[PDB]
Amino acid sequence: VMGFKTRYGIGINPFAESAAQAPASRIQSGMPSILNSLGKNAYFRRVYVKGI
Amino acid sequence: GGKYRVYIDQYAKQDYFTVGYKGPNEMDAGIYYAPYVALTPLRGSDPKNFQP
């Protein structure tokens, strides 16, 4: 019987959303989610391309 | 008095003492502890989840 295992977690930059003066409750998750970072991370931008 | 080896029953049920005799031979004790084996480790694993 054989296999393998890992652990590494995940997280984001505290100011990545750039869309608020401050986060709710003075405590949040650093783990990205639909309520935290989807479509909000200031470090990245996406553009679709068509018609080359 | 230099005569009796006094020990403490830390779990005495209420308050008492017992006086006893142990001579120089193992046959002068009145009681015997006869270990055969001890602390044989039990070791293995379950590979289905690989826990020890």
Residue-wise DSSP of A18-31: ---SS-GGG----S
CA nearest neighbour of A41 among A15, A5, A4: A15
Q: Which residues pair with B46 in a beta bridge?
A: B51
Q: Within an 8 Å CB–CB cutoff, is residue B44 touching chain A?
A: no
Closest CA to B33 of B41, B42, B22, B44: B22
Phi-psi category of residue B26: left, alpha or beta, with phi > 0 → left and psi -120 to 50 → alpha: alpha
**Can you tell me the distance from the alpha carbon of B45 to that of B48, in angstroms, rounded to the nearest whole number?**
9
B2: alpha, beta or left, given left = phi > 0 and alpha = psi -120 to 50? left
**Amino acid identity of A2?**
M
Q: What chain B residue is nearest to A1 in terms of C-alpha separation?
A: B47
| A4–chain B Cβ distance below 8 A for any pair | no
Partnered with residue B51 across adjacent β-strands are B46
Within chain A, what is the greatest distance between any pair of CA atoms? 53
